[PDB]
């Protein structure tokens, strides 16, 4: 029973129940099976993990777990005690069970314990009862695994959860060594690629990992995550993941953009590649965008451009990269006559962005507009300044009026000023 | 009477009904009176302005107008049709009245017509019927005024709604002269000052504008508006407007940050000004705000933190002192990295503690019970936190696709 779908596992405003219904309905339209609930800043998941859901909070979770069954999406509930749990103290252990008990009674069969991003050493109390840090986590993870009547799916996210993060390397890591050998065969292990946000997942890297973990690990995929850069959004295709991986993995859960409606392409393209076990990113994209266009006035070309302007954490799209070379060329070669020719076609490429913004803002699906509004606005106003600059470079053989004739000319606020001082 | 309150008048996601109602509570609590409903991207306000409210929308809107009255806050309903409306066509004009009427039966008794940020020239059909651009708008505004029974509050917003937007200057403008002379004595005129986002609104500029429109304007203030930059938020005090503007004005309506919860300082201090020292009003506003951040209740964020937040996200032309200071200190360190007397080590230390306090601010803000406030400010506080972290460690050394595509063009512009 191979696990594929979404983890809502980012920092920030989490999604609301209504968005997660529409999420389930979408996972089913496209044949995915799983949803891991793990949003970092829903306070009871992490910051106040010992605290029980209030009465109305409970009503919400149950109505959520319901619509999960109603759509036959499997619902895994995560908890993150990492920050401040004392592993050796039995009152601590017991609060975790009491909490996991409460959610069990909401309808929840599937569970997860995450331990990403915690201060790597322990308290004075813990360093006695336990040999190493990795000992403590596995002891509690196992203990818990038992208690719940050893549930069907059950995930464990290690502190060392990607290649970069392994000390000193993947292969001969005390932490990783301990996990593979001590942590129960019925417990899955989440893994994130070579890096936190992996450009690509080599088949040799995962085979490598399966070495020390003694399992086919579950991928927490950070490819379309945007919680770490305010300006950034990711409407590109699922890519850099070999089709040959499906055999070798227990699953992939995609950790996608915070803006819910932006995640169409991210989930669709995950879904097409779930099938097929090459697979073609360029084509999956073409499919997703044509199907996506049905929801929205805007042309397919607009969406093609939009996805190109916000593509992937390591790659711009065709039209976006082309605009970049073109402006780079133009700025470089100032002053027989290809410049005027190329500045004219570039001034037109900019206008197509203005066009895409106009059509999006006149569109009928307002939930989609609002989620992306500030992203499209930023790009349009930048191109508009870029266009206006190319004109300035050109109308310069007959003027020496400098490039300013209003605070949207000097961007970024304080953060922007600090950034321009770093190399 | 003099109008002081908020205009929901920005591009982007509009506030929801449960947020607007909360706005009403706070306007009353702080003894403000007015709310101008103008959200640019709430369709049916501008884009599909012709289209009338559904059965369910009608219920929502009415409930809201009720709550305005319940809270002794004047509700002014604005409509922005001037995008593609044909002025002479009576099909459009009758479609306008019918739109206005429908909200009237929602309980609404005050109105506005907005003609801001729209092409200077008309179609040929209207180039016939009307002499200049001004003439066209005045004509239709006046009609809808009478059509509705010449109501107590009626607002009109020019296309030349600020100093720089006037042809060729304010005093001698064709357009302003036609509005001033021919727009009905009972309608009020919106004005944002010298610029779209006026750093100051000096008295003389208001004397200059009042002369040509022959009335005292209503200030649509963009001092705290943040719709125009992804990375900007303004939590500084109402500043740059002399209290002697009040005799010379019919109102100030503030057009504040998009994130609802970030508007606490911006609205509190405008109120404070309405009854002035920006620094003292910030202290008053931050002190009261602190009470809205709790620790969550458990069955198993300080004033200094707020001040650091405000100073980091302050006003559109000025950083708060703590912000400005860190920026000063970092510049001095970066300059004298060659020097590794070593007063530098002593100063790098106090800088690293300053950076420390930014992290601390974020950690505590993320524990607080009021998650509406946390969510609204998250991505801003996160951003400053990540940068100060990298600044801290680069200071100690003595992101290629950062900002995405937009960022990459922005680094090629030279104004940066």
């Amino acid at each position: 029973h191979f696990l594929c779908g979404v983890v809502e596992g980012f920092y920030g405003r989490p999604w609301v129940m209504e968005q997660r219904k529409e999420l389930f309905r979408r996972l089913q339209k496209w044949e995915l099976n799983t949803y891991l609930y793990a949003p970092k800043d829903d306070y009871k998941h992490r910051m106040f993990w010992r605290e029980m859901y209030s009465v109305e909070e409970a009503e919400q979770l149950m109505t959520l777990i319901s619509a999960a069954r109603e759509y036959e999406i499997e619902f895994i509930y995560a908890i993150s005690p990492g920050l401040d749990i004392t592993f050796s103290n039995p009152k601590e252990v017991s609060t975790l069970k009491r909490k996991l008990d409460q959610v069990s009674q909401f309808g929840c069969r599937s569970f997860a314990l995450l331990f990403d991003n915690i201060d790597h050493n322990m308290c004075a109390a813990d360093k006695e009862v336990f040999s190493s840090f990795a000992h403590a986590q596995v002891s509690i993870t196992n203990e818990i695994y038992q208690y719940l009547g050893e549930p069907e799916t059950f995930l464990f996210c290690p502190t060392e959860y990607c290649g970069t993060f392994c000390y000193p390397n993947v292969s001969q890591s005390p932490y990783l060594r301990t996990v593979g050998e001590k942590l129960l065969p019925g417990i899955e292990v989440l893994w994130t690629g070579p890096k936190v946000v992996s450009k690509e997942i080599p088949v040799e890297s995962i085979e490598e990992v399966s070495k020390i973990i003694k399992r086919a690990p579950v991928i927490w995929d950070n490819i379309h995550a945007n919680d770490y850069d305010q300006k950034r959004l990711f409407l590109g295709p699922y890519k850099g993941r070999s089709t040959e991986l499906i055999p070798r993995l227990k699953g992939v859960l995609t950790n996608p953009n915070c803006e819910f409606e932006a995640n169409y392409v991210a989930i669709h393209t995950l879904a097409t590649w779930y099938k097929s076990n090459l697979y073609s990113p360029q084509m999956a994209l073409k499919l997703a965008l044509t199907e996506w266009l049905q929801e929205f006035s805007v042309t397919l070309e607009d969406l093609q451009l939009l996805a190109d302007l916000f593509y992937l954490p390591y790659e711009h799209g065709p039209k976006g990269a082309q605009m970049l070379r073109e402006f780079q060329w133009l700025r470089a070669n100032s002053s027989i006559e290809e410049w005027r020719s190329r500045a004219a076609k570039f001034e037109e490429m900019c206008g197509l962005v203005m066009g895409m913004f106009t059509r999006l803002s006149n569109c009928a699906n307002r939930t989609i507009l609002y989620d992306m509004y500030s992203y499209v606005w930023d790009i349009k106003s930048i191109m508009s300044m870029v266009k206006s600059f190319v004109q300035w470079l050109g109308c310069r053989s007959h003027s020496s009026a400098q490039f300013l004739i209003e605070p949207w000319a000097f961007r970024g606020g304080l953060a922007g000023e600090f950034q321009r001082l770093l190399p | 009477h003099f109008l002081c309150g908020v205009v929901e008048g920005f591009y982007g996601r509009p506030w929801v009904m449960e947020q607007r109602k909360e706005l009403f509570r706070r306007l009353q609590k702080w003894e403000l009176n007015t709310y101008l409903y103008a959200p640019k991207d709430d369709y049916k306000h501008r884009m599909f302005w012709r289209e009338m409210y559904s059965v369910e929308e009608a219920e929502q809107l009415m409930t809201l107008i009720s709550a305005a009255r319940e809270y002794e806050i004047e509700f002014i309903y604005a409509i922005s049709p001037g995008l593609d409306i044909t002025f002479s066509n009576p099909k459009e004009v009758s479609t306008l009245k019918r739109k206005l009427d429908q909200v009237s039966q929602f309980g609404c008794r005050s109105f506005a017509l907005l003609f801001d940020n729209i092409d200077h020239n008309m179609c040929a059909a209207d180039k016939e019927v009307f002499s200049s651009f001004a003439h066209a708008q005045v004509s239709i505004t006046n009609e809808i005024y009478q059509y509705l029974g010449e109501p107590e509050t009626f607002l009109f917003c020019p296309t030349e709604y600020c100093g720089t937007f006037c042809y060729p200057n304010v005093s001698q403008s064709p357009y302003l002269r036609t509005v001033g002379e021919k727009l009905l004595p009972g309608i009020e005129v919106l004005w944002t000052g010298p610029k779209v986002v006026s750093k100051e609104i000096p008295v003389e500029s208001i004397e200059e504008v009042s002369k040509i429109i022959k009335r005292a304007p209503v200030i649509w203030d963009n001092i705290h508006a943040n719709d125009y930059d992804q990375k900007r938020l303004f939590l500084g005090p109402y500043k740059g407007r002399s209290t002697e503007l009040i005799p010379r004005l019919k109102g100030v309506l503030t057009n504040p940050n998009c994130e609802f919860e970030a508007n606490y300082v911006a609205i509190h201090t405008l109120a404070t000004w309405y009854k002035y020292s920006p620094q003292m009003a910030l202290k008053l506003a931050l002190t009261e705000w602190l009470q809205e951040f709790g620790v969550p209740h458990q069955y198993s964020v300080t004033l200094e933190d707020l001040q650091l937040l405000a100073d980091l996200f302050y006003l559109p032309y000025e950083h708060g002192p703590k912000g400005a200071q860190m920026l000063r200190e970092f510049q001095w360190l970066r300059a004298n990295s060659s020097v590794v007397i070593e007063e530098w080590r002593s100063r790098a230390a106090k800088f690293e503690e300053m950076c420390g306090l930014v992290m601390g601010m974020f950690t505590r803000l993320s524990n607080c019970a009021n998650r509406t406030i946390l969510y609204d400010m998250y991505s801003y506080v996160w951003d400053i936190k990540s940068i100060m972290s990298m600044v801290k460690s680069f200071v100690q050394w003595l992101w290629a696709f950062r900002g995405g595509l937009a960022g990459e063009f922005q680094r090629l512009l030279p104004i940066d």
Binding site: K40, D116, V196 | -
Partner: peptide
């Protein structure tokens, strides 16, 4: 690093 503290 994703995060901490």
């Amino acid at each position: 690093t994703s995060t901490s503290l």
